[PDB]
Design a protein around this ligand. Structure first.
Ligand SMILES: Nc1ncnc2c1ncn2[C@@H]1O[C@H](COP(=O)(O)OP(=O)(O)OP(=O)(O)O)[C@@H](O)[C@H]1O
Ligand SMILES: Nc1ncnc2c1ncn2[C@@H]1O[C@H](COP(=O)(O)OP(=O)(O)OP(=O)(O)O)[C@@H](O)[C@H]1O
Length: 1127
């Protein structure tokens, strides 16, 4: 196998294609994979087997070593000495064999994951356009992310399904004194515990899935709040929002608490089983014959090995193996989906023809285009219009071959250049997008960018042609993005050009210039098809096509339309000034014209009250499980003293469990408190200070830190308690029996501490790389999916495959490094442990072990100490991560005449002053407003009034200086409607009144007053209607009216309007102006405008530039100076 994506793909594709081609009904992905996998997998598998079997040998060697100190036979020092050497070698050898093999398995898992990803990517780019709208988008994201961190770890246990029965059979077969079947007592106990654990694990999954659903809801409201803190503060909404968070948090905790108990009992159950396999193991020796230390010590070590292989190594592989298979099956179902069918290029014609085409998207379709017919000569212009939905753009999909005809033929000449309705951002170099995938030629480039009028904006870009367009399109306005899409489509040399919604939401002036510049001259003699709403274009076009309800309304000469459907023409012409109508209005006019011219309970309470009932219930479970094991013991079918001793053991264990329950209670309480305090601290935060994170780390830390406290503190703590108790016992006993062991062990622990610290520093830093390399694989994917229509249209598939592979290679390189440092670390750790082991074995062997039982116990304690120690290493790693998270959390918590005198503002106490020494007066009830350049800090006056900025000077409102008024009332006076309006998701009643202070009747009265009564009536449920996704169903004008309704209910006196005109068409802007003037007849209205025509209705003006201002008492004084200063 290969170490790179290109090679891994070739191999997978060859086997997959060969089997898929060998069409034995249902070819399978799993077979293509086993043919790659098997010849490496099996070798690491056998090596691990050979490694693990060592554990089944080591106890035998100790039994003989122990025997050498017996009074029997002779004190053969030399034998004890050499056998001791052999034992320490067994530790060393398995260490040296096992770790390399585990590493190799992870290497394999990685290689397979990469091959699978490249296969999927290649497939998504070849999918049929029909199934494209049936496959949920969330499924492709999860198809790749769901097993991202699972598949490659899972192979580590895969060969255990195979190993487990070999070691179980051996350990069973090695039992000494086998017929007195202590074997069944042992196995019956372990078997019952294993099923118990499986059941409990299933309950854990139930809780995880339900909780996950609630988490997503909490996170959505959380990000909504975080990105709009200024509106929450401006509204003085505050704690109502805090309460919304509280109810979501409370819901999650109820589920979490139950999940926590599942985890608690799982861990104590594990402990319980440890005790009993050892305890049951000595029941034979108490029962008749008596004790032989030689055999007892041997017996216990074997019992320990069975516990672990039986309860943990086996079922882990079973669960892993099964889930992995299910993941593969899902991938296969995805791969086996209908393809995009390639278009066959030919030299049949020069024009475009359509012969009786009838077609539809899917089965059960009524949107069948009927009897479509064309004959277009080379170089002719076709203009198409029609009702929205009557195949306005679906026709283009037929032309390009995305949609097949059910009947008829489509003939075309050569290659097609296509520009879609919705621009594809293509993050990257702007010149490169214009000429993407083609050679640069300045002759053509200049001609196209000049003709398309790009120079007007692109020459203002800081790196010109090399200005990079980043994510979000922060460089370009929607009309500019459209302009680039045209330039790209034009730059490409094609025989046929298809222009989807070419008007581009552009100003009519440029729209005309582009049509003549491009449609007529730049595109001269090309065959063209334009989608259009302008009658002038139809007049210009050689052929006119109008569609309605899936069929042709009219096809022919412009004058033929007028001669054959004159009433249609006359009605449209009544709106003679069509160039003055936006596309939306042009669309409504044709839609209407065209359709018009149609042509238990008592005790439950006591159980909560009496903790003594809780104790009994704990004991009852313990009794039950032992009795079940007895049922299996009774297999022998085909005493009072034993009964007493086992009863005693159960009682003691039950009390031990009962004692620790308050810890679970405490853990849930603590994370609840921390979540609540962080939220409070963020809401009542200073402004400017939060700009250190700018919502990035705020959302990410808020979300992630809470999640880790809840899943790990309640888990890692219990493992630590058990591990701690074990080591205390182990050290205490050897220290007493032989003080030289202590002397020897002190430097051993020191060695581990130092290595650990070094390791964690570096590995914690490397971990950052997974996220850095991982994020872009998804950004790449999404971009490719949105661009699918053009990726095929222009033949760019291999370009993108190349980019995808480079991203994968980056990711795997970092992933691999992380894995490698971890493995090295673990190997070093194990070798240190191996060395102290050898030394300890010899301390015992060497000293005067004349009371041999003491020799035996030191040796078995040391031999079996390694299991616990491996857990301890990993637990220490988790602890350090938890403490780092705790610190990150802790870091956050441990006047009618408005009179403004000498006002100054900054974005921080350092920084820059955005406004200095401004003085300004507003007469009571006076309509006033502001003029200034875009980016002159207009919003910083509004924020200075809202007290969101570092500020100086004296503002007198409601008769007093701001200096004597707290933020809530100071802000209360100001009813502000920002350009970016915040919409709270949820029921309209709450969106408008989050406190429940207004009555429904009152709410309706205001809805009527502000013109939203018809809007709320239209939405089902009215006040009970739930508004979603930021008001995705509302006009932004409506959002402004909602804000208005809030302002009037709130009884604000100062009304602040942030350029409503920035987005609202005058046809409605005047309606809201009338509405608010009546609503605010007794109030003072302050407007920030972009144009003189709007500012014109004001009596006093504030004109701001360069952190200074000129006050005018009349528009004429403003105009006289503005003319002199019109620059
Ligand atoms: N691949 C598809 N499968 C099924 N239905 C589709 C598919 N693509 C679009 N549609 C729908 O069927 C019709 C397709 O026609 P077309 O896309 O030409 O309409 P349009 O008038 O261009 O759409 P609009 O102007 O509303 O964006 C639309 O009314 C749309 O709702
Ligand atoms: N709190 C802030 N910290 C840092 N920079 C800011 C802050 N507030 C605004 N800015 C920036 O400084 C200027 C502030 O002016 P303002 O926010 O009034 O601009 P605008 O003309 O309203 O811009 P837009 O049209 O994008 O809304 C802008 O050009 C913006 O880029």
């Amino acid at each position: 196998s290969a170490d790179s994506a290109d090679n891994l793909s070739e191999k997978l594709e060859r086997e997959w294609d060969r089997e898929l081609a060998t069409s034995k009904k249902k070819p399978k992905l799993i077979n293509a994979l086993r043919r790659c996998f098997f010849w490496k997998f099996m070798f690491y598998g056998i090596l691990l087997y050979l490694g693990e079997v060592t554990k089944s040998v080591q106890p035998l060697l100790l039994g003989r070593i122990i025997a050498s100190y017996d009074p029997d036979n002779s004190s053969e020092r030399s034998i004890a000495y050499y056998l001791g050497i052999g034992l320490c070698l067994l530790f060393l050898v398995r260490t040296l064999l096992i770790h390399p093999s585990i590493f190799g398995l992870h290497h394999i898992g990685m290689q397979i994951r990469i091959a699978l990803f490249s296969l999927i990517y290649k497939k998504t780019l070849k999918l049929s356009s029909k199934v494209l709208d049936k496959i949920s988008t969330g499924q492709l994201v999860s198809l790749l992310s769901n097993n991202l961190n699972k598949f490659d770890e899972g192979l580590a246990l895969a060969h255990f399904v195979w190993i487990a029965p070999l070691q179980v059979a051996l350990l069973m077969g090695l039992l000494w004194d086998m017929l007195q079947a202590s074997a069944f007592a042992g196995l019956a106990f372990l078997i019952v515990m294993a099923f118990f654990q499986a059941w409990l694990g299933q309950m854990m999954m139930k809780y995880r899935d339900k909780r996950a659903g609630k988490i997503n809801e909490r996170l959505v409201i959380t990000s909504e709040i975080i990105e709009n803190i200024q509106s929450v503060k401006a509204y003085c909404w505050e704690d109502a929002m805090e309460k919304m968070i509280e109810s979501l948090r409370e819901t999650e905790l109820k589920l979490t608490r139950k999940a926590a108990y599942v985890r608690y009992f799982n861990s104590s159950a594990f402990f319980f089983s440890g005790f009993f396999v050892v305890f049951l193991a000595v029941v034979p020796y108490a029962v008749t014959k008596g004790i032989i230390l030689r055999k007892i010590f041997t017996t216990i070590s074997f019992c320990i090995v069975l516990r672990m292989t039986v309860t943990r190594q086996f079922p882990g592989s079973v669960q892993t193996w099964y889930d992995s298979i299910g993941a593969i099956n899902k991938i296969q179902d995805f791969l086996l989906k209908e393809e995009y069918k390639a278009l066959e290029y030919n030299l049949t014609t020069t024009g475009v023809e359509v012969d009786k085409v009838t077609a539809f998207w899917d089965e059960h379709a009524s949107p069948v285009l009927q009897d479509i017919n064309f004959k277009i000569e080379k170089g002719e212009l076709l203009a198409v219009s029609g009702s929205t939905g009557s195949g306005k753009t679906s026709l283009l999909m037929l032309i390009m071959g995305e949609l097949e005809p059910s009947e008829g033929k489509i003939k075309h000449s050569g290659r097609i250049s296509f520009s879609p309705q919705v621009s594809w951002i293509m993050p990257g170099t702007i010149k490169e997008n214009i000429i993407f995938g083609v050679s640069y030629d300045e002759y053509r480039y200049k001609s196209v960018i000049q003709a398309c009028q790009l120079e007007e904006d692109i020459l203002k870009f800081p790196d010109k042609d090399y200005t990079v367009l980043g994510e979000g399109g922060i460089i370009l306005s929607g009309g500019q993005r459209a302009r680039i899409s045209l330039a790209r489509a034009v730059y490409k040399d094609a025989d046929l050009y298809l222009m989807d919604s070419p008007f581009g939401y552009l100003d009519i002036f440029t729209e005309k210039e582009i049509f003549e510049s491009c449609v007529c001259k730049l595109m001269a003699n090309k065959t063209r098809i334009l989608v259009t709403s302008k009658l002038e274009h139809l007049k210009i076009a050689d052929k006119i096509l109008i569609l309605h309800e899936g069929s042709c309304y009219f096809y022919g000469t412009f004058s033929e339309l007028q001669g054959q459907r004159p009433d249609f023409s006359s009605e449209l012409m009544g709106f003679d000034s069509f160039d003055q109508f936006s596309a939306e209005r042009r669309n409504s006019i044709i839609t209407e014209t065209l359709r018009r011219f149609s042509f238990w309970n008592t005790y439950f309470r006591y159980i909560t009250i009496h903790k003594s009932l809780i104790f009994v219930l704990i004991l009852c479970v313990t009794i039950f499980l032992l009795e079940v094991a007895a049922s299996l013991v009774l297999l022998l079918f085909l005493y009072y003293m034993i009964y007493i001793y086992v009863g005693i053991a159960d009682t003691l264990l039950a009390m031990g469990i009962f004692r620790g329950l308050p810890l679970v209670h405490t853990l849930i309480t603590v994370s609840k408190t921390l979540h609540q305090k962080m939220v409070h601290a963020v809401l009542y935060a200073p402004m400017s200070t939060f700009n250190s994170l700018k919502a990035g780390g705020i959302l990410n830390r808020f979300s992630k830190d809470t999640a880790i406290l809840d899943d790990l503190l309640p888990l890692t703590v219990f493992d630590l308690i058990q591990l701690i108790l074990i080591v205390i016992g182990a050290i205490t006993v050897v220290s007493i029996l032989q003080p030289y062991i202590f002397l020897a062990s002190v430097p051993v622990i020191a060695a581990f501490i130092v290595l650990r610290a070094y390791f964690l520093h570096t590995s914690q830093q490397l971990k950052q790389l997974e996220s850095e390399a991982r994020s872009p694989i998804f950004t790449h994917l999404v971009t490719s999916l949105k661009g699918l229509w053009t990726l095929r249209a222009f033949g760019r598939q291999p370009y993108f495959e190349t980019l995808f592979h480079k991203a994968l290679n980056l990711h795997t390189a970092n992933w691999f490094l992380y894995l490698s440092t971890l493995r090295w670390f673990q190997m070093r750790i194990e070798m240190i442990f191996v060395v102290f082991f050898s030394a300890v074995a010899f301390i015992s062997i060497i000293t005067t072990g004349d009371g041999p039982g003491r020799v035996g116990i030191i040796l078995t304690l040391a031999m079996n100490i390694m299991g616990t120690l491996q857990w301890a290493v990993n637990s220490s790693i988790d602890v350090d991560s938890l403490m780092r998270s705790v610190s990150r959390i802790f870091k956050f918590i441990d006047g009618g005449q408005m009179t403004v005198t000498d006002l100054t503002a900054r974005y921080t106490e350092g920084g820059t002053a955005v406004l200095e020494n401004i003085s300004f007066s507003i007469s009571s009830g006076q309509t006033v407003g502001l003029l200034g350049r875009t980016g002159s800090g207009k919003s910083t006056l509004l924020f200075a009034f809202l007290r969101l900025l570092n500020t100086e000077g004296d503002i007198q409102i409601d008769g007093v200086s701001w200096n004597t008024v707290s933020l809530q009332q100071w802000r209360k006076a100001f009813g502000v409607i920002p350009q970016k309006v915040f919409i709270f998701s949820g029921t309209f009643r709450k969106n408008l009144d989050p406190y429940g202070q207004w009555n429904d009747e009152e709410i309706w009265k205001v809805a009527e007053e502000v013109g939203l009564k018809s809007v709320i009536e239209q939405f089902p449920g009215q006040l009970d209607f739930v508004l979603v996704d930021g008001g995705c169903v509302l006009s932004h004008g409506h959002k402004q009216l909602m804000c208005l309704a809030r302002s009037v209910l709130s009884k604000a006196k100062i009304l602040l309007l942030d350029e409503p005109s920035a987005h609202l068409d005058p046809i409605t802007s005047q309606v809201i102006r009338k509405t608010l003037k009546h609503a605010f007849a007794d109030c003072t209205v302050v407007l920030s405008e972009s144009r003189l025509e709007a500012i014109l209705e004001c009596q006093r003006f504030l004109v701001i530039e360069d952190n200074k201002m000129r006050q005018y008492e009349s528009i004429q004084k403003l105009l006289s100076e503005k003319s002199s200063l019109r620059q």
